[PDB]
């Protein structure tokens, strides 16, 4: 939180939480990084000249631009490396000198114009530090945005442009931050994937040259997560140096790493710039999204823990924040599409005797939605399906104890639909070309303040039409041929970000009007799994597949930066679906009772002896769901390193703890295996239901003598309770 | 120091330092191996029963000896993996069968009959267990001796074996310990090397079977040090679980780690069994030498910093344990052979007003000496070369200022000597065989007693016949034809062991008989570089290979367990000998500075800059002397692991420290380079000589940034002191 300017040294001090952060003014007003990492009281701010790398000063050969380490560097006055931005001027030059203008310090961290952002509830939680820069020839300014909050080891930065002369400007590269280390000995870490194994962590040595992960794809995607690390080369879950950067957005992205031939690590990360321009008239600006800067000495799970923290109770907001979600049951396989409400009440009680607490109802309750190909757009509910609409379904599912809840896809539209005939312009295209499908279906153009106005109104005539307390808003197609009709052509490449920022606005809106409904998000799973969704939604559907041991790999990674509140993870039958496999219903219990839990069967299927498995796991999550929602949670085995996954949740006066061990293909006449636990208090003893009495010391630093077995897949939860 | 049983659970506990050592009786009698780690208030002591491990209990299926983690097991009933002892019996079986008997525990250390070890002293510093072990049948007793340390994580372990029935039992196998690990999930550390290059580190993962180092050579060797560890695979120089297992023995030894088929580890280290046999009579006794086992977590500079408090203080002794050591000078290479008197004395002022502390004159002084050929054994002054004796020559030496010191050779006889044609039969040999040379040498047979009184008698004569305060005691080959004509047939193999304990009884005696003496061991360098040497001599010389470069790796690994004060560096001339290199006086000043420092060379070469430089180096290590030789130390960058090697010394109190750093083969046009500290008060600021004022904290966590050089040898000591 303590953010200082030293006038005598030049040197900006920011102290987050454990962490210091300290830039340093530079010669004729450039800005220098000098150090992130474990607090210090002070640091002070070498052969910056070097072969090949020129004088921005011809009175100065002390310096270049490609030595000097930065905050926010450009390329074209003696900087060789990769620049934070770039500005396209009228005569065709992208050459700009950013020099330090002023500065302001202030208590409190700023709402972002248009965007999610971190935030606090009290000034005293955070400080903000604008830095304000400017290249006087051409009236460029942009002003470096930094918060330090007090309690956590956290450091958020974002730009914000503005155009303060009297020619155009165009920014074809905006990044949100850029640090120069002052040295590359580390690996990074960052989280590709794909549809149905989202979020592998992957750790890799840097190499001299970049590094990087991006999304071109309109959102922030399966394949790649908006997050890299910087981690020490011996740094694990427990110990060691960890930098995290988390980008909080929702669209395209890049996430970099350069390493220069001095071995300096440039990181840097903003809206993906391949694309991309944005045009600043005069009197215009442009605000980046935030990068939510973390450290750690205390390895990964030092940096994931502060990240959940943050990003459960300083970003994501509403009703629903701080309370524990409903176990919910999504009524698809119960039909695919097949349905009417005859069967939808009786499944309700069944549902309801389980001790489930939410009933969902899934796609095609609307229009002529009755495969992956119609209707999508036209929102009035189908009432031949639902003859009594959606109030008396709801209303009957509410008097059995349940609530009721709604899918929507208010992003896309079909080809076939009644918008899509009245308004074909509304959707993504560019003049005289195909429009390419995904399902069968098209984007709508949320760059177009008609279509949000259009969304936003329609979507809320269903949701005012009955007692609905959850919406799922899944989006399930990327975006090919971005333009808009609405935009000019020297605007066309904004049309990815503006349609970003229009689904914001709606989404931000629909939460607005709907106090009462706890909103999901999902895009075939977790395609948009990213902070910029979770300020507006508290809970996202971490992926399609529901496959208890590729769960463990997809809920593992996903941690890294994500809170398990907002961590969906539900049960689902088997034969399983993307991969095909069979693991006991105990199993597949155990993997989502380690997430945000909920099912997604039909319930029309199970046996008595099933449902009373049901019964039993429900009565179970609910009396340790405040403990997994809402504890400090410590990874302690990787299914990335070997053939376990082993993590556990611990109270806040770690009076109680819920601890998960899994193993697969497990070898015959195998060695023991043991599991130390963190967390804990080493002088407290506990009692581990079916394994006795332990201290706190021996479960940590001996472990737990796991109970000999053997077989495809092994799965164990524990509940501790200080004697 | 705090050690326990609990007759309820029959455990015993074993506190040290911050470590536990926890053992416990398993059915009947049998003593099982439960923890050792991180200090616990209490540990509870599966799958004992496995395919092909048989059951020594046919009432009992239920466990093995193949299975059982063990402290002290045998071969041959239902154990198959290593043994830690082995006995064969009249009837020429091999199978013993101990099981406990009964225990006590008292307070302090007891010493060991014929042996060096570790001491306390006061009865508080430390307790001891002693388990009985027995086997009826036979009449074998083995008592399982244990201390636990207060002060330190130290755990010392040895066994003594008594044959209280009526039959010869010969010992095979005699090892000091062992202990069961449950996991293998280690790498192992060991330090091998050569002449010239003792004392590599080594880390290699364990393999499944056997992994050991050892020595053959009747001597613990320049090839391997009795030294090993195992590590957490995470494990660094400043964090992570580290087990050492240190022996307190100068013969043949063997070090061994053996995985099972279940991955369990045993370490089990002790006397080198090969070629050795010891036979007990009814009635007789055999006590192995200790191994001093060290647990930290706070990786390998926490495992060694305990080696080094605890060997400095706890088995170094005799009046210059806690003293500053003398900066010394040889003066050989000043005459190799070719001397007498009239230099002497000079070279003497030259070298007081120089400021070195204590002359010492090598080889050839006795009887007719004058290659590596001659006259060993016959330890009477030529009186040509010295016609006014020792006497003469250190009472100049003493009125110039410095102490006078000696080499002696006194475990070897030339075959030409007046020794050797009166008593050849006193060598090490076998009946009928050539005697095999090592440097044109003969070894005596030290487990003789008439050898060891002439020896005690002869080197005697010598030293009380001038006021010298200095000796070096060298040994320069290795044992072959191993054998003694005062043995009978069947103690033949007791040889190489009684020639220890011989020696050992001599440098006991010696060392007591001249208290005023500072007595440093030599084998060609750090050939027997050990602590059970370190119990009669507080310094050995650590190598004969002086080059910068060389021993930077040498004193690296030397310092994994051995203090400072006991490893001897020296500035020695150049062209270098062994490798051929040239560095400058600075640079050698630098390496040698960081441990016990002396110097090596003729100073009628040197030019009067050079003397100069000399001068400033012994004011300088004078000033820093007690820093190096008694302050905490800690290794930053390993030789091993790069072109860089660093290191550091910091006072008690943290008020003052020495930093230093080198690198090798610095390339043109490099990155920049830093070095974080360790061991400061992150609160105080420091001085750092020629760089300024710097926090402790941003020493630590952010680093100093060393002056940018580049060249084939850098070379840089700060020191730091609080302000």
Known sequence: MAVTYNPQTK????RAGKASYVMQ??????????????????????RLDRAFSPNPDPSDRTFSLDTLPQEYPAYGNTDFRSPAYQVQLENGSTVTDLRYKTHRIYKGKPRLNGLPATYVEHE???ETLEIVLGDALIGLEVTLQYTAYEKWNVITRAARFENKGGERLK????????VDFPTADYDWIHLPGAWGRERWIERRPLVTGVQ???????????QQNPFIALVAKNADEHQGEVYGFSFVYSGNFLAQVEVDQFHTARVSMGINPFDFTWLLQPG????????VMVYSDQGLNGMSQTYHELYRTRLARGAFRDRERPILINNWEATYFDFNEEKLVNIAKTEAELGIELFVLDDGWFGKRDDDRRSLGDWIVNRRKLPNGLDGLAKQVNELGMQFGLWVEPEMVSPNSELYRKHPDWCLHVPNRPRSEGRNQLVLDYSREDVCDYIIETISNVLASAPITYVKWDMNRHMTEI?????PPERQRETAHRYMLGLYRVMDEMTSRFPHILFESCSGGGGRFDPGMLYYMPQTWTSDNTDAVSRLKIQYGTSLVYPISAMGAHVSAVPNHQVGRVASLKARGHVAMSGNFGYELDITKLTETEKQMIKQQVAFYKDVRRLVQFGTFYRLLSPFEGNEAAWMFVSADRSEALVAYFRVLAEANAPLSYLRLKGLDPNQDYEIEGLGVYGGDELMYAGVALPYRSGDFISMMWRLKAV
């Open 284 to 291: 215009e600006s442009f605000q980046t999204p935030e990068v």
């Open 25 to 46: 003014l530079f010669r004729s007003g450039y800005l220098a990084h000098i150090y992130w990492g474990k607090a210090v009281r002070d640091v002070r701010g070498s």
């Open 124 to 126: 005293q939680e955070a």
């Open 483 to 487: 333009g808009s009709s609405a935009l």
């Open 171 to 178: 920014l074809l590269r905006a990044l949100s931050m850029s």
């Open 11 to 14: 040197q900006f001090h920011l």
């Open 212 to 222: 990087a992960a991006e999304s071109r794809r309109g959102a922030s995607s399966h």
